[model samples]
Target chain A: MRYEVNIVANPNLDQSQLALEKEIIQRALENYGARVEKVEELGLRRLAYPIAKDPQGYFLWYQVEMPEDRVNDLARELRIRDNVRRVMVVASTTP
Target chain B: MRYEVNIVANPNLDQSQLALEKEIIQRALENYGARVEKVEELGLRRLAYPIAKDPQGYFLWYQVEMPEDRVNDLARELRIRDNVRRVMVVASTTP
Candidate 1:
């Protein structure tokens, strides 16, 4: 199954740390027997609600192919990552 | 203050229907002492959760300027519209 995960992180991170955060997401997918197909940076946008005392955040979207059972686990793990502020996962039902 | 509202609507509507929906949105803003600055159509995208038994929806982002107290009312009015499936509101603090 293919899953789309959207996450928002603190925009205060340095350039290198931002790259590392993306790497961590890819690693998470690999750990769950998934392959990250695409990662899109959505730039900075103001949040609808203040999170972690920040009104703005950097948004990232990842499309990955992984098994059904691993999807929730991957989302839970993502939430625990220090750099990730919020994560939403959607599994594709189509072929 | 400017507010950003993102909404997802049923993709089954025709072109004319879409136009009418936008008109309704503009009227909503006007009624609430606001002006619609920009309305962007985000095309069809799959939803994170199936809403109204549909897996996909047409997304729209509206940028408007209105008083903070009226934002929630506008959002609530949008939900009552027949075609809108979801709505999110964000207020910009910057000048």
Candidate 2:
């Protein structure tokens, strides 16, 4: 199944850190037998309600084709890592 | 601030029940002085991961302009309601 995973990561990372973070996320997904196909950085923006002390976050939007069962596994890994503000996985039917 | 609230409600609601649910939600928001401008039903869709026993949910998208502090109050109310699967509020800058 195709899934869109939107990750709201810590906003303080720099350019290189963001890339490294993305690489690490891809590895995490691949470790769960998921093939990450596309990644887009939506933007750094304010949260409607602050998560902790940070009022903003960086959005990492990833579209992947992966087994259905591995979806929660990936989400769990991201949810606790580096204080991720939010991690949402939704099944995507569109290209 | 303009906010977009996406509510994943219980999928089993009938047409009239959904209306009452929406009305109740609007009243909750208005109780906190929110002005709900538009409401849209996105769809009834499967959750990427099930929330409790329900694997599917009905989407209620509401656009409202409200004070900042009342946001969390609304979320707290919905979060513990008759099993709303999810309720997300994001700052919306678009028309």
Candidate 3:
């Protein structure tokens, strides 16, 4: 199955700082056996509601195709990671 | 201020009916004097959690430049609209 995965981190971290967690996500998904088809860096976005006392967020969007069974597991685990404000995995409607 | 606005509708509606509500969003934003910079049709996505008892969602993402004042008003009102599952408006960090 294909999925659109989005992860946004707290904006207090600069690109160099945020790069570490982002790489961790990349490696984590790969370890989960997901195929990353595309990646887009969304730069920074201001939050409507403050996150961790910061009013901004830096985001990355991923287009991936992976098996269904472990997606929720990965998303749930990623949600608990520090500085990771939001983690979303929506399965694709297309086959 | 520039904002990334995402709106997802309940999947129970057909494409034709869904298009009606989407046009309403476009018209409402334009009426608010927002510049619709880009629009992307994201087809449909399976929800991790069901929305309104439906397991899928039809969505549209907008990149718009608009003043900050009326954003919350619009977002709040959109939230109450029927079948509109989610409405997110995040301001841009870049000037």
**Which candidate gets the maximum lDDT versus the true structure?**
3
Model 2, position B2: C-alpha lDDT score: 82
Query: Residue A58 in model 3: shift from native, Å?
Result: 2.1
Q: Which candidate achieves the best DockQ against the true structure? A: 3
lDDT of 3 by residue, A10-73 (tens): 7678778788888888898898888989988887877662123566678888888887887887
How does model 3 do on interface RMSD, in angstroms? 3.5
What is the alpha-carbon lDDT of model 3 when measured against the actual structure? 0.79
Model 2 agreement with the true structure over A32-71: per-residue lDDT tens digits: 8888899887667565642446557787889889888778
Clashes of each: 0, 0, 0
Tens-digit per-residue lDDT, A1-95, candidate 1:
77778897877789799889888888888888888899888757665522235667778888898777677778878778788888877655432
DockQ of each candidate, alpha-carbon based: 0.25, 0.22, 0.51
lDDT of 3 at A75: 83
As for candidate 1, its clashing pairs are none
What TM-score, to 2 decimals, does candidate 2 have? 0.62
**TM-score of predicted chain B, candidate 1:** 0.82
Q: List the residue pairs that clash in candidate 3.
A: none
Put down candidate 1 lDDT per residue, B1-95, tens digits, no spaces: 77778887777889899889878877887888888898887766665432236667777888887777677777888879879888877665432
C-alpha lDDT values of all predictions? 0.76, 0.76, 0.79
The best candidate in terms of TM-score: 3
TM for every model, in the order presented, reads: 0.59, 0.62, 0.85
Query: How close to the true structure is residue A61 of candidate 2, measured as C-alpha lDDT?
Result: 83
